[PDB]
Amino acid sequence: SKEGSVAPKERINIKYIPATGDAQAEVAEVELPLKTLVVGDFKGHAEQTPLEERATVTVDKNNFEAVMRESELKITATVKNKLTDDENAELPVELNFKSLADFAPDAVASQVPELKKLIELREALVALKGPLGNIPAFRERLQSLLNSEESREKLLAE
Amino acid sequence: GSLLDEIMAQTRIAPSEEGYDIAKKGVAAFIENLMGSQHSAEPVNKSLVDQMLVELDKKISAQMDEILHNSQFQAMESAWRGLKLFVDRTDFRENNKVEILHVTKDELLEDFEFAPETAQSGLYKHVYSAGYGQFGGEPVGAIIGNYAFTPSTPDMKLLQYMGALGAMAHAPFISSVGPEFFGIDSFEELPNIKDLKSTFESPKYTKWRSLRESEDARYLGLTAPRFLLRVPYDPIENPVKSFNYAENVSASHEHYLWGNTAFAFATRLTDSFAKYRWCPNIIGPQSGGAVEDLPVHVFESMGALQSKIPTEVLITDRKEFELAEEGFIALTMRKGSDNAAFFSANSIQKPKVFPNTKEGKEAETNYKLGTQLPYMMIINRLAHYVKVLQREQIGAWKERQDLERELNSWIKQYVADQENPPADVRSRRPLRAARIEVMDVEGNPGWYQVSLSVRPHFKYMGANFELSLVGRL
Amino acid sequence: KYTKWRSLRESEDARYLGLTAPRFLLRVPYDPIENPVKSFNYAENVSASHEHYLWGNTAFAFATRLTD
């Protein structure tokens, strides 16, 4: 960290060392944004901490998916069971919401294990419809399964 | 192993490469339901698969109209998706921020019962001291109340402690009244009310008519009926991924995701600020009080094809004017479309009748301008700017003549003392005249009782149009 | 291997040191049609080794732009 210089003399000795600079820190009167405080019940319980210790979170369009994920909106309730022939049956659920698409029935039914087997039932039926009507030899062996009733029921349990 | 023979004869996925475990579950599931009606034909089976999907969707969507539409779910969906309607509309690039506070409505009155004075409460910490009462901190414009107010004592004690909080931090508390506030217990019978003035002069509302007369009620607006948030889903209009979901909405209109209109009224506080950097512009169907892009739901009525009204009642013009005199920010809906409008943002304060002197007839019109609340929001900003601007100055070398000048040369960029300026000069400069009279305090010299006396422009409300014919002229 | 390089770069007097380009070509190999020689036909058989081309040093060519 030393500039190469010459021996000093009656001749003039130019050297290059860059200087510290003068900033003179510029004024900037920033203005006040119109800040609102949305207050109200945003989760499914009553928090045990008193009000003077809990915090306010700032939400804009870019971080709304992160504020919703870190809230852990866990909605646990007992709802009516309409998956069987019982009218007086009930079925509690367990919900974990991390995005705005978790309100949609694609992700609500995916978090209910009684509905994970019904979408998997439908996905197995959409898979059937493609190769069903293309090969006309499927109905030829439906009558063979109509004939072979013993070996068919042994394979349905598997 | 005949099921393996059907996979190997199926030449699309025969030699156990990919998708052979899913299609094996497809064959075995269809045979278990095939015994209800024996038939052997693939194109009828292509309908019989579909006849096992329509009966399946009757099993699933009847369950997903019960996992949804629950009082714990829907009240926590409208309180959160309605926030997304407040985040998506407000332009955060145009100097806007919004704080989110988790309270519950029963906790909040206990928190005002917690402190002996409202100036030591826990909500006073988040409204005043963490925001406005803070060096450099951004101050609070308004408080959205995501509540459903009753006229009972645990909800008139809260608003008495929110009007006093709103008079300290200079921020009006906007929330909404419920159906049970009007005494109807089911909301769509509101236009059936034939006299709403006599309803409010009932002895059930003694803690309401005493709230209205109070001085700090100026910072309390209570908003509209309600508004719609989510269109119910449909396998053609708004589908879902890998599923067909027809949300069977019954005759009960409580199953629609009805939001709270303190969200939607604060949309107009902020979309007025994102355009003109002020907020008197909240009461215009073509001038900034128009809640646009509401959800609509076209369903079949008794013969005709109508639309579900996005606010739960059709507020007439006489009903809205009777709500305007009684201190309510009502939202009339543009009947037949997806728009709505505010017309008058009057706070709950009552214009006090002053005696018929020269000053009394004057000060009655002076006190009337305080209650209306677009005009509070052009002086709440003249309490948030001036608190911040005269906070930096502490410790300077100033005078009383210098104090008069740093304020008069400041607010006269907000003053357009002009009878007819253009439509942009009126809203960028919302004031019209401003008087500042700086005085002293004797005994302890150097304490300055100044009197900033602003004056606004005046909007458009009511006329007469008394038609006739002349015949010649 | 470059500890005496990354310590050269941080130094103050390294400001007066530029190190130039790959290399550049100087002489087209001769041809009895294109660039002939007097009273002789010379086809310079350039092999697959590209070291036989007259490759110059680009400190010549970068100082061409200092002077032009």
Side-chain angles (χ1 to χ4, degrees), chain A residues 29 31-43 45 51-52 54 56-59 61 64 68 76-77 79-80 82-83 97 103 105-106 122 124-125, chain B residues 26 59 63 66 70 72-73 76 79-81 87 92 95 97-103 107 111 125-126 138-142 144 146 240-241 243-244 277 381 384:
Chain A
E29 183 177 1
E31 66 181 2
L32 301 175
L34 194 277
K35 180 175 75 175
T36 59
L37 188 144
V38 177
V39 75
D41 193 4
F42 292 152
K43 295 181 186 182
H45 62 87
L51 183 55
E52 69 270 14
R54 67 183 70 185
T56 66
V57 63
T58 300
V59 171
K61 293 174 69 176
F64 182 73
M68 188 178 177
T76 299
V79 301
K80 298 293 184 182
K82 299 293 183 182
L83 296 175
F97 292 157
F103 289 162
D106 291 331
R122 182 173 178 176
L125 292 174
Chain B
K59 292 181 181 179
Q63 183 64 41
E66 294 294 326
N70 194 1
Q72 184 176 0
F73 185 79
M76 279 61 252
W80 190 265
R81 186 181 289 272
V87 174
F92 290 96
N95 288 318
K97 289 183 182 178
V98 51
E99 291 181 353
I100 296 303
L101 183 60
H102 180 199
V103 306
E107 185 178 2
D111 188 76
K125 186 177 179 181
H126 296 286
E138 53 185 2
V140 172
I144 289 95
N146 195 359
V240 295
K241 298 292 184 181
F243 187 76
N244 295 115
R277 302 293 174 88
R381 300 288 290 164
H384 300 103

Coordinates of all heavy atoms in Angstrom, one line a residue, chain A residues 29 31-43 45 51-52 54 56-59 61 64 68 76-77 79-80 82-83 97 103 105-106 122 124-125 132, chain B residues 26 59 63 66 70 72-73 76 79-81 87 92 95 97-103 107 111 125-126 138-142 144 146 240-241 243-244 277 381 384, unseen atoms left out:
Chain A
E29 N -36.5 15.2 2.3 CA -37.7 15.2 3.1 C -38.6 14.2 2.6 O -39.4 14.4 1.6 CB -38.3 16.6 3.2 CG -39.6 16.6 4.0 CD -40.2 18.0 4.1 OE1 -39.7 19.0 3.5 OE2 -41.2 18.2 4.8
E31 N -41.8 11.7 2.8 CA -43.2 12.1 3.2 C -43.7 10.9 4.1 O -43.1 9.8 4.2 CB -44.1 12.4 2.1 CG -44.3 11.2 1.2 CD -45.2 11.5 0.0 OE1 -45.6 12.7 -0.2 OE2 -45.5 10.5 -0.8
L32 N -44.9 11.1 4.6 CA -45.5 10.1 5.5 C -46.5 9.3 4.7 O -47.4 9.9 4.1 CB -46.3 10.8 6.6 CG -45.3 11.6 7.5 CD1 -46.2 12.3 8.5 CD2 -44.3 10.8 8.2
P33 N -46.3 8.0 4.6 CA -47.3 7.2 3.9 C -48.6 7.1 4.8 O -48.5 7.1 6.0 CB -46.6 5.9 3.7 CG -45.6 5.8 4.8 CD -45.1 7.2 5.0
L34 N -49.7 6.9 4.1 CA -51.0 6.8 4.8 C -51.0 5.4 5.4 O -51.5 4.4 4.7 CB -52.1 7.0 3.8 CG -53.6 7.2 4.2 CD1 -54.4 6.0 4.5 CD2 -53.6 8.1 5.4
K35 N -50.5 5.2 6.6 CA -50.5 3.9 7.2 C -51.8 3.6 7.9 O -52.3 4.4 8.8 CB -49.4 3.8 8.2 CG -49.3 2.4 8.9 CD -48.1 2.2 9.7 CE -48.3 2.9 11.0 NZ -47.2 2.6 11.9
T36 N -52.5 2.5 7.6 CA -53.7 2.1 8.3 C -53.3 0.8 9.2 O -52.4 0.1 8.9 CB -54.8 1.7 7.3 OG1 -54.3 0.7 6.5 CG2 -55.2 2.9 6.5
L37 N -54.1 0.6 10.2 CA -54.0 -0.5 11.1 C -55.2 -1.3 11.0 O -56.2 -0.9 11.6 CB -53.6 -0.1 12.5 CG -53.2 -1.1 13.5 CD1 -52.2 -0.5 14.5 CD2 -54.4 -1.5 14.4
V38 N -55.2 -2.4 10.3 CA -56.4 -3.3 10.2 C -56.4 -4.2 11.5 O -55.5 -5.0 11.7 CB -56.3 -4.2 9.0 CG1 -57.5 -5.1 9.0 CG2 -56.4 -3.3 7.8
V39 N -57.4 -4.0 12.3 CA -57.5 -4.7 13.6 C -58.7 -5.6 13.5 O -59.7 -5.2 12.9 CB -57.5 -3.7 14.8 CG1 -58.9 -3.0 14.9 CG2 -57.1 -4.4 16.0
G40 N -58.6 -6.8 14.1 CA -59.7 -7.7 14.1 C -59.2 -9.1 14.1 O -58.1 -9.4 13.9
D41 N -60.2 -10.0 14.4 CA -59.9 -11.4 14.6 C -59.5 -12.1 13.3 O -60.2 -12.3 12.4 CB -61.2 -12.1 15.1 CG -61.0 -13.5 15.7 OD1 -59.8 -13.9 15.8 OD2 -62.0 -14.1 16.1
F42 N -58.2 -12.5 13.3 CA -57.6 -13.1 12.1 C -57.2 -14.5 12.2 O -56.8 -15.1 11.2 CB -56.4 -12.3 11.7 CG -56.7 -10.9 11.3 CD1 -55.8 -9.9 11.4 CD2 -58.0 -10.6 10.7 CE1 -56.1 -8.6 11.0 CE2 -58.3 -9.3 10.3 CZ -57.4 -8.3 10.5
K43 N -57.4 -15.1 13.4 CA -57.1 -16.6 13.6 C -58.3 -17.2 14.3 O -59.3 -16.6 14.6 CB -55.8 -16.8 14.4 CG -54.6 -16.3 13.7 CD -53.3 -16.5 14.5 CE -52.1 -15.9 13.8 NZ -50.9 -16.2 14.6
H45 N -58.7 -18.6 17.4 CA -58.7 -18.8 18.8 C -58.5 -17.4 19.5 O -58.7 -16.4 18.9 CB -57.6 -19.7 19.2 CG -56.2 -19.3 18.9 ND1 -55.4 -18.4 19.7 CD2 -55.5 -19.5 17.8 CE1 -54.3 -18.2 19.1 NE2 -54.3 -18.8 17.9
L51 N -52.1 -7.8 25.3 CA -52.1 -7.1 24.1 C -50.8 -6.3 23.9 O -50.3 -6.1 22.8 CB -53.4 -6.2 24.0 CG -53.5 -5.4 22.7 CD1 -53.5 -6.3 21.5 CD2 -54.8 -4.7 22.7
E52 N -50.3 -5.8 25.0 CA -49.1 -4.9 25.0 C -47.8 -5.6 24.6 O -46.8 -4.9 24.4 CB -49.0 -4.2 26.3 CG -48.5 -5.1 27.4 CD -49.7 -5.8 28.2 OE1 -50.8 -5.7 27.7 OE2 -49.4 -6.3 29.3
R54 N -47.8 -8.4 22.1 CA -47.9 -9.0 20.7 C -47.6 -7.9 19.7 O -47.7 -6.7 20.0 CB -49.2 -9.6 20.5 CG -50.4 -8.6 20.4 CD -51.7 -9.3 20.3 NE -52.1 -10.1 21.4 CZ -53.1 -10.9 21.5 NH1 -53.9 -11.0 20.4 NH2 -53.4 -11.6 22.6
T56 N -47.5 -6.1 15.6 CA -48.2 -5.8 14.4 C -47.2 -6.1 13.2 O -46.1 -5.8 13.2 CB -48.5 -4.3 14.3 OG1 -47.4 -3.5 14.2 CG2 -49.3 -3.9 15.5
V57 N -47.8 -6.8 12.2 CA -47.0 -7.2 11.0 C -47.4 -6.4 9.8 O -48.6 -6.0 9.7 CB -47.2 -8.8 10.8 CG1 -48.6 -9.1 10.5 CG2 -46.2 -9.2 9.7
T58 N -46.5 -6.0 9.0 CA -46.7 -5.2 7.8 C -46.8 -6.1 6.6 O -46.0 -6.9 6.3 CB -45.5 -4.2 7.7 OG1 -45.4 -3.4 8.8 CG2 -45.7 -3.3 6.5
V59 N -47.9 -5.8 5.9 CA -48.3 -6.7 4.7 C -48.4 -5.8 3.5 O -49.1 -4.8 3.5 CB -49.7 -7.3 5.0 CG1 -50.2 -8.0 3.7 CG2 -49.6 -8.3 6.1
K61 N -48.3 -6.5 -1.1 CA -48.7 -7.5 -2.1 C -47.6 -8.6 -2.3 O -48.0 -9.7 -2.6 CB -48.9 -6.8 -3.5 CG -50.1 -5.9 -3.5 CD -50.2 -5.2 -4.8 CE -50.6 -6.1 -5.9 NZ -50.7 -5.4 -7.2
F64 N -47.6 -11.1 1.2 CA -48.9 -11.6 1.8 C -48.8 -13.1 1.9 O -49.5 -13.7 2.8 CB -50.0 -11.1 0.9 CG -51.4 -11.6 1.5 CD1 -51.9 -11.0 2.6 CD2 -52.1 -12.6 0.9 CE1 -53.1 -11.4 3.1 CE2 -53.3 -13.0 1.4 CZ -53.8 -12.4 2.5
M68 N -49.3 -15.0 5.6 CA -50.3 -16.1 5.8 C -49.6 -17.4 6.3 O -50.2 -18.2 7.0 CB -51.1 -16.3 4.5 CG -52.2 -17.2 4.7 SD -53.2 -17.4 3.2 CE -54.4 -18.6 3.9
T76 N -59.5 -26.2 13.3 CA -60.0 -27.5 13.7 C -61.4 -27.4 14.2 O -61.7 -26.8 15.2 CB -59.1 -28.1 14.8 OG1 -57.7 -28.1 14.4 CG2 -59.5 -29.4 15.3
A77 N -62.3 -28.1 13.5 CA -63.7 -28.1 13.8 C -64.4 -29.4 13.5 O -63.8 -30.2 12.7 CB -64.5 -26.9 13.1
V79 N -67.4 -31.1 11.7 CA -68.4 -30.8 10.6 C -69.2 -32.1 10.4 O -68.9 -33.1 10.9 CB -67.8 -30.2 9.3 CG1 -67.1 -29.0 9.6 CG2 -66.9 -31.3 8.7
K80 N -70.3 -31.9 9.6 CA -71.2 -33.0 9.3 C -70.6 -34.0 8.3 O -70.0 -33.6 7.3 CB -72.6 -32.5 8.8 CG -73.3 -31.6 9.8 CD -73.7 -32.3 11.0 CE -74.5 -31.5 11.9 NZ -75.0 -32.2 13.2
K82 N -71.2 -36.3 5.4 CA -72.0 -36.6 4.3 C -71.4 -37.6 3.3 O -71.7 -37.6 2.1 CB -72.5 -35.3 3.6 CG -73.3 -34.4 4.4 CD -74.6 -35.0 4.8 CE -75.4 -34.0 5.6 NZ -76.7 -34.6 6.1
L83 N -70.5 -38.4 3.8 CA -69.8 -39.4 2.9 C -70.4 -40.8 3.0 O -70.0 -41.7 2.4 CB -68.3 -39.5 3.3 CG -67.5 -38.2 3.1 CD1 -66.1 -38.3 3.6 CD2 -67.5 -37.9 1.6
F97 N -53.0 -24.0 6.7 CA -53.1 -23.1 5.6 C -51.8 -22.3 5.5 O -51.3 -21.7 6.4 CB -54.3 -22.1 5.8 CG -55.6 -22.7 5.7 CD1 -56.7 -22.1 6.3 CD2 -55.8 -23.9 5.0 CE1 -58.0 -22.7 6.2 CE2 -57.1 -24.5 4.9 CZ -58.1 -23.9 5.5
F103 N -57.3 -22.1 0.6 CA -58.7 -22.0 0.8 C -59.5 -22.8 -0.3 O -60.7 -23.1 0.0 CB -59.1 -20.6 0.7 CG -58.7 -19.7 1.9 CD1 -58.7 -18.3 1.8 CD2 -58.3 -20.3 3.1 CE1 -58.3 -17.6 2.9 CE2 -57.9 -19.6 4.2 CZ -57.9 -18.2 4.1
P105 N -60.8 -25.8 -2.7 CA -61.1 -27.2 -2.4 C -60.1 -28.3 -2.9 O -60.3 -29.4 -2.6 CB -62.5 -27.5 -3.0 CG -62.6 -26.5 -4.1 CD -61.9 -25.3 -3.6
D106 N -59.2 -27.9 -3.7 CA -58.1 -28.8 -4.1 C -57.2 -29.0 -2.9 O -56.7 -30.2 -2.8 CB -57.3 -28.2 -5.3 CG -58.1 -28.2 -6.6 OD1 -59.0 -29.1 -6.7 OD2 -57.9 -27.3 -7.4
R122 N -61.1 -40.8 -8.0 CA -61.4 -40.2 -9.3 C -60.2 -40.2 -10.2 O -60.4 -40.4 -11.4 CB -61.9 -38.7 -9.0 CG -62.3 -38.0 -10.3 CD -62.9 -36.7 -10.1 NE -63.2 -36.1 -11.3 CZ -63.8 -34.9 -11.5 NH1 -64.2 -34.2 -10.4 NH2 -64.1 -34.4 -12.7
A124 N -58.0 -42.5 -10.4 CA -58.0 -43.8 -10.9 C -59.1 -44.1 -12.0 O -59.0 -44.9 -12.8 CB -58.2 -44.9 -9.8
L125 N -60.2 -43.3 -11.9 CA -61.3 -43.4 -12.9 C -61.0 -42.6 -14.2 O -61.5 -42.9 -15.3 CB -62.6 -43.0 -12.3 CG -63.2 -44.0 -11.2 CD1 -64.4 -43.4 -10.6 CD2 -63.4 -45.3 -11.8
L132 N -60.1 -47.0 -22.3 CA -61.3 -47.8 -22.1 C -61.9 -48.1 -23.5 O -61.9 -49.2 -24.0 CB -62.3 -47.2 -21.2
Chain B
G26 N -56.9 -48.4 -11.0 CA -58.1 -48.0 -11.8 C -59.0 -49.1 -12.2 O -60.2 -49.0 -12.2
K59 N -71.1 -37.2 -3.6 CA -70.6 -37.5 -2.3 C -69.5 -36.5 -1.9 O -69.4 -36.3 -0.7 CB -70.0 -38.9 -2.4 CG -71.0 -40.0 -2.5 CD -70.4 -41.4 -2.6 CE -71.4 -42.5 -2.8 NZ -70.8 -43.9 -2.8
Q63 N -69.8 -33.0 0.9 CA -68.9 -32.9 2.0 C -68.1 -31.6 2.0 O -67.9 -30.9 3.1 CB -67.9 -34.1 2.0 CG -67.0 -34.1 3.2 CD -67.7 -34.2 4.5 OE1 -68.7 -35.0 4.6 NE2 -67.3 -33.5 5.5
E66 N -69.7 -28.7 3.5 CA -69.8 -28.8 4.9 C -68.5 -28.6 5.6 O -68.5 -28.2 6.8 CB -70.4 -30.2 5.3 CG -71.9 -30.3 4.9 CD -72.8 -29.4 5.6 OE1 -72.5 -29.0 6.8 OE2 -73.8 -28.9 5.0
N70 N -68.6 -23.2 7.4 CA -68.7 -23.4 8.8 C -68.5 -22.1 9.5 O -67.7 -21.2 9.0 CB -67.7 -24.5 9.3 CG -67.9 -25.0 10.7 OD1 -68.9 -24.6 11.4 ND2 -67.0 -25.9 11.1
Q72 N -66.7 -21.4 12.2 CA -65.3 -21.2 12.5 C -64.5 -20.9 11.2 O -63.6 -20.1 11.2 CB -64.8 -22.4 13.2 CG -63.3 -22.2 13.7 CD -62.8 -23.3 14.5 OE1 -63.6 -24.3 14.8 NE2 -61.6 -23.3 15.0
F73 N -64.9 -21.6 10.1 CA -64.1 -21.4 8.9 C -64.5 -20.1 8.1 O -63.6 -19.3 7.8 CB -64.4 -22.6 7.9 CG -63.5 -22.6 6.7 CD1 -62.2 -23.0 6.7 CD2 -64.1 -22.1 5.5 CE1 -61.4 -22.9 5.6 CE2 -63.3 -22.1 4.4 CZ -62.0 -22.5 4.4
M76 N -63.5 -16.9 9.7 CA -62.1 -16.8 9.6 C -61.6 -16.8 8.1 O -60.4 -16.8 7.9 CB -61.3 -17.8 10.4 CG -61.2 -17.5 11.9 SD -62.8 -17.3 12.8 CE -62.8 -15.5 13.0
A79 N -62.7 -12.7 7.2 CA -61.8 -11.8 7.9 C -60.4 -11.9 7.3 O -59.5 -11.1 7.7 CB -61.7 -12.2 9.4
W80 N -60.1 -12.8 6.5 CA -58.7 -13.0 5.9 C -58.7 -12.8 4.4 O -57.7 -12.2 3.9 CB -58.1 -14.3 6.3 CG -56.7 -14.4 6.0 CD1 -56.1 -15.0 4.8 CD2 -55.6 -14.0 6.8 NE1 -54.8 -14.9 4.9 CE2 -54.4 -14.3 6.1 CE3 -55.5 -13.4 8.0 CZ2 -53.1 -14.0 6.6 CZ3 -54.2 -13.1 8.5 CH2 -53.1 -13.5 7.8
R81 N -59.6 -13.3 3.7 CA -59.7 -13.0 2.2 C -60.1 -11.6 2.0 O -59.7 -11.0 1.0 CB -60.6 -14.0 1.5 CG -60.6 -13.9 0.0 CD -61.6 -14.9 -0.7 NE -61.1 -16.3 -0.6 CZ -60.3 -16.9 -1.5 NH1 -59.9 -16.2 -2.5 NH2 -60.0 -18.1 -1.4
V87 N -55.5 -5.6 0.2 CA -54.1 -5.6 -0.2 C -54.0 -5.5 -1.7 O -53.1 -4.7 -2.3 CB -53.3 -6.8 0.3 CG1 -51.9 -6.9 -0.2 CG2 -53.3 -6.8 1.8
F92 N -49.3 -0.2 -3.2 CA -48.3 0.0 -2.2 C -47.0 0.7 -2.7 O -46.2 1.1 -2.0 CB -47.8 -1.4 -1.6 CG -48.9 -2.0 -0.8 CD1 -49.8 -2.9 -1.3 CD2 -49.0 -1.6 0.6 CE1 -50.7 -3.5 -0.5 CE2 -49.9 -2.2 1.4 CZ -50.8 -3.1 0.9
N95 N -46.8 5.0 -1.8 CA -46.6 5.4 -0.4 C -47.8 5.0 0.5 O -48.5 5.8 1.0 CB -46.3 6.9 -0.3 CG -44.9 7.3 -0.8 OD1 -43.9 6.6 -0.5 ND2 -44.8 8.4 -1.5
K97 N -48.7 1.8 3.5 CA -48.4 0.7 4.3 C -49.6 0.3 5.1 O -50.5 1.2 5.4 CB -47.2 0.9 5.1 CG -45.9 0.9 4.3 CD -44.6 1.0 5.2 CE -43.4 1.1 4.4 NZ -42.2 1.3 5.2
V98 N -49.7 -0.9 5.5 CA -50.9 -1.3 6.4 C -50.4 -2.3 7.4 O -49.7 -3.3 7.1 CB -52.0 -1.9 5.5 CG1 -51.6 -3.0 4.5 CG2 -53.1 -2.5 6.4
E99 N -50.7 -2.0 8.7 CA -50.3 -2.9 9.8 C -51.5 -3.8 10.1 O -52.6 -3.5 9.9 CB -50.0 -2.1 11.0 CG -48.7 -1.3 10.9 CD -48.3 -0.5 12.2 OE1 -49.2 -0.5 13.1 OE2 -47.2 0.0 12.2
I100 N -51.1 -5.0 10.6 CA -52.1 -6.1 10.8 C -51.9 -6.5 12.3 O -50.9 -7.0 12.7 CB -51.8 -7.3 9.9 CG1 -52.1 -6.9 8.5 CG2 -52.7 -8.5 10.3 CD1 -53.4 -6.4 8.2
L101 N -53.0 -6.3 13.1 CA -53.0 -6.6 14.5 C -54.0 -7.7 14.8 O -55.2 -7.6 14.4 CB -53.3 -5.3 15.3 CG -53.3 -5.6 16.8 CD1 -51.9 -6.0 17.3 CD2 -53.7 -4.3 17.6
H102 N -53.6 -8.8 15.4 CA -54.4 -9.8 15.9 C -54.9 -9.5 17.3 O -54.2 -9.6 18.3 CB -53.7 -11.2 15.9 CG -54.5 -12.3 16.4 ND1 -53.9 -13.5 16.9 CD2 -55.8 -12.5 16.5 CE1 -54.8 -14.3 17.2 NE2 -56.0 -13.8 17.0
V103 N -56.2 -9.1 17.4 CA -56.9 -9.0 18.6 C -58.1 -9.9 18.4 O -58.4 -10.4 17.3 CB -57.3 -7.6 19.0 CG1 -56.1 -6.7 19.1 CG2 -58.4 -7.1 18.1
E107 N -61.4 -9.5 23.6 CA -60.2 -9.1 24.3 C -60.0 -7.6 24.3 O -59.4 -7.1 25.3 CB -59.0 -9.8 23.5 CG -57.7 -9.7 24.2 CD -56.6 -10.4 23.4 OE1 -56.9 -11.0 22.4 OE2 -55.4 -10.4 23.9
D111 N -59.0 -5.1 27.4 CA -57.7 -4.4 27.4 C -58.0 -2.9 27.6 O -57.0 -2.2 28.1 CB -57.1 -4.6 26.0 CG -55.7 -4.0 26.0 OD1 -54.8 -4.6 26.6 OD2 -55.5 -2.9 25.4
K125 N -50.9 1.7 22.7 CA -49.5 1.5 22.4 C -49.3 1.3 20.9 O -48.3 1.7 20.3 CB -48.9 0.3 23.2 CG -47.4 0.1 23.0 CD -46.9 -1.0 23.9 CE -45.4 -1.2 23.7 NZ -44.8 -2.3 24.5
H126 N -50.2 0.6 20.2 CA -50.0 0.2 18.8 C -50.6 1.3 17.9 O -50.1 1.4 16.8 CB -50.7 -1.1 18.5 CG -50.0 -2.3 19.2 ND1 -48.8 -2.8 18.9 CD2 -50.4 -3.0 20.3 CE1 -48.5 -3.8 19.7 NE2 -49.4 -3.9 20.6
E138 N -43.8 6.1 11.2 CA -44.9 6.5 10.3 C -46.2 6.5 11.1 O -46.5 5.6 11.9 CB -45.0 5.5 9.1 CG -45.1 4.0 9.5 CD -45.0 3.1 8.3 OE1 -44.9 3.7 7.1 OE2 -45.1 1.9 8.4
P139 N -47.0 7.5 11.0 CA -48.2 7.7 11.8 C -49.4 7.0 11.2 O -49.4 6.6 10.0 CB -48.4 9.2 11.8 CG -47.9 9.6 10.5 CD -46.8 8.8 10.2
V140 N -50.4 6.8 12.0 CA -51.6 6.0 11.7 C -52.7 6.8 11.1 O -53.1 7.8 11.7 CB -52.1 5.2 12.9 CG1 -53.4 4.5 12.6 CG2 -51.0 4.2 13.4
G141 N -53.1 6.5 9.9 CA -54.2 7.2 9.2 C -55.5 6.8 9.7 O -56.3 7.7 10.0
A142 N -55.9 5.5 9.7 CA -57.2 5.1 10.2 C -57.1 3.7 10.7 O -56.1 2.9 10.5 CB -58.2 5.1 9.0
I144 N -59.1 0.2 10.8 CA -60.1 -0.7 10.3 C -60.6 -1.6 11.4 O -59.8 -2.4 11.9 CB -59.6 -1.5 9.1 CG1 -59.4 -0.6 7.9 CG2 -60.6 -2.6 8.7 CD1 -58.0 -0.1 7.7
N146 N -62.6 -4.8 12.1 CA -63.2 -5.9 11.5 C -64.2 -6.6 12.4 O -64.2 -7.8 12.7 CB -62.1 -6.9 11.1 CG -62.5 -7.9 10.1 OD1 -63.6 -8.0 9.7 ND2 -61.5 -8.8 9.7
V240 N -61.7 -25.8 -10.7 CA -60.6 -26.1 -9.8 C -59.8 -27.2 -10.5 O -60.3 -27.9 -11.4 CB -61.1 -26.6 -8.4 CG1 -61.8 -25.4 -7.7 CG2 -62.1 -27.7 -8.5
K241 N -58.6 -27.4 -10.0 CA -57.6 -28.3 -10.7 C -58.0 -29.7 -10.5 O -58.0 -30.2 -9.3 CB -56.2 -27.9 -10.3 CG -55.7 -26.5 -10.6 CD -55.6 -26.3 -12.1 CE -55.0 -24.9 -12.4 NZ -54.9 -24.7 -13.8
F243 N -60.6 -31.4 -10.8 CA -61.9 -31.7 -10.0 C -62.9 -30.8 -10.6 O -62.6 -29.7 -11.1 CB -61.7 -31.5 -8.5 CG -62.9 -31.9 -7.7 CD1 -63.1 -33.2 -7.5 CD2 -63.7 -30.9 -7.2 CE1 -64.2 -33.6 -6.7 CE2 -64.8 -31.3 -6.4 CZ -65.1 -32.6 -6.2
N244 N -64.2 -31.2 -10.5 CA -65.3 -30.4 -10.9 C -66.1 -30.1 -9.6 O -66.7 -31.0 -9.0 CB -66.2 -31.1 -11.9 CG -65.4 -31.3 -13.2 OD1 -65.2 -32.4 -13.6 ND2 -65.1 -30.2 -13.9
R277 N -52.6 12.1 -3.0 CA -51.8 12.2 -1.7 C -52.6 13.0 -0.6 O -52.0 13.6 0.2 CB -50.5 12.9 -2.0 CG -49.6 12.1 -2.9 CD -49.3 10.7 -2.4 NE -48.6 9.9 -3.4 CZ -47.3 9.9 -3.6 NH1 -46.5 10.7 -2.9 NH2 -46.8 9.1 -4.6
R381 N -54.2 14.7 8.6 CA -52.9 14.9 7.9 C -52.3 16.2 8.3 O -51.0 16.2 8.4 CB -53.1 14.8 6.4 CG -53.7 13.5 5.9 CD -52.7 12.4 6.0 NE -51.6 12.5 5.1 CZ -50.4 11.9 5.2 NH1 -50.3 11.0 6.2 NH2 -49.5 12.1 4.3
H384 N -50.6 15.0 11.4 CA -49.5 14.0 11.3 C -48.3 14.6 10.6 O -47.2 14.3 11.0 CB -50.0 12.8 10.5 CG -51.1 12.0 11.1 ND1 -52.4 12.1 10.7 CD2 -51.1 11.2 12.2 CE1 -53.2 11.4 11.5 NE2 -52.4 10.8 12.4

